[PDB]
Amino acid sequence: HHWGYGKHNGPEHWHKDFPIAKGERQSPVDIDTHTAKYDPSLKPLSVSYDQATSLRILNNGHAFNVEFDDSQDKAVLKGGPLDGTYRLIQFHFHWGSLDGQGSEHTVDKKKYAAELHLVHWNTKYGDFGKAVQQPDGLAVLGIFLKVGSAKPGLQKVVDVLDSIKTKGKSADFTNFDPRGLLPESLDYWTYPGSLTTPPLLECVTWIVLKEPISVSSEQVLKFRKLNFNGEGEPEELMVDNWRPAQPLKNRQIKASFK
Ligand SMILES: [N]S(=O)(=O)[N][C]C123[B@]45[B@@]67[B@@]89[C@]1%10B81%11B698B746B814B562B%10%1143
Ligand SMILES: [Zn+2]
């Protein structure tokens, strides 16, 4: 009875194994655009992905991760609300069964079709596993996806999904450039939060871009052909792998823009 996204093991249940699920800085949250305040203290955001080295893509039974070599300073996120240098370790998505749902963060309660998470760790902590135990251990860059035109820089990801349909399957995924997943603007909201999957640790500075990327219906339909189950098991399509918005509690969402 492992955690997942169904009736019996979904987000409503996670607090039994992971009591921090009802904690003071859980993610995702609704971003109320009228209450978010412009913060002149935020430095410019720096997303330096030119030297990123992808290694592999993996179906972990809740999503797929595109993994990077993080053994040196190649693809880093700096600036904005962050102190120091955060190294890219992987990205993954959350998505829906229908185009009207799928994102984790919401914007004035609007749900997007999906949400990309580029996960980075604070190099002052030496490794990811140490970083997740710190309040400023991780920075996750969140990008909304809406359905419209195709995102060409996503298609390499879409085209390998057939090879990792079921839980535990992985595939070589070198030379993927995550710059092709970024929108034009780096305007963002930022707040302190958590991992949105177990273990739900409260170690993330969230940086959520205002501008969504557009992906095609055909692209998102291929995400929805993945399976939560492993090979040879009854098919459970990998859809609706998102946690809903959690209580904002004693937090302020800051905007980088006027
Ligand atoms: N939606 S999230 O970015 O909060 N998920 C973070 C993850 B992914 B899955 B579970 C938590 B552990 B494994 B791997 B590692 B990273 B961290
Ligand atoms: Zn995520």
From Swiss-Prot:
Quote the record's binding site residues for Zn(2+). Answer: 92, 94, 117
Identify which cofactors the protein needs according to its UniProt entry: Zn(2+); Co(2+)
Known EC number? 4.2.1.1, 4.2.1.69
GO BP: angiotensin-activated signaling pathway; carbon dioxide transport; morphogenesis of an epithelium; neuron cellular homeostasis; positive regulation of cellular pH reduction; positive regulation of dipeptide transmembrane transport; positive regulation of synaptic transmission, GABAergic; regulation of chloride transport
CDD domains reported for this sequence: alpha_CA_I_II_III_XIII
Q: What is the effect of changing residue 60 to L?
A: Reduced activity
The subcellular localization recorded is: Cytoplasm; Cell membrane
Q: What is the effect of changing residue 195 to F?
A: Normal activity
Summarizing the annotation, the consequence of altering residue 63 to S is: 2-fold decrease in enzyme efficiency, as determined by kcat/KM ratio, and efficiently inhibited by chlorzolamide
Q: What's the protein here called?
A: Carbonic anhydrase 2
Classification from the root reads: Eukaryota, Metazoa, Chordata, Craniata, Vertebrata
Q: What else is known?
A: Target of drugs used in treatments against glaucoma disorder and breast cancer.
Instruction: Name the consequence of residue 60 to A.
Output: Reduced activity
Recorded hits in InterPro entries, A to Z, give: CA_dom, CA_dom_sf, Carbonic_anhydrase_a-class, Carbonic_anhydrase_a-class_CS
Please describe the quaternary structure of this protein. Answer: Interacts with SLC4A4. Interaction with SLC4A7 regulates SLC4A7 transporter activity. Interacts with SLC26A6 isoform 4 (via C-terminus cytoplasmic domain).
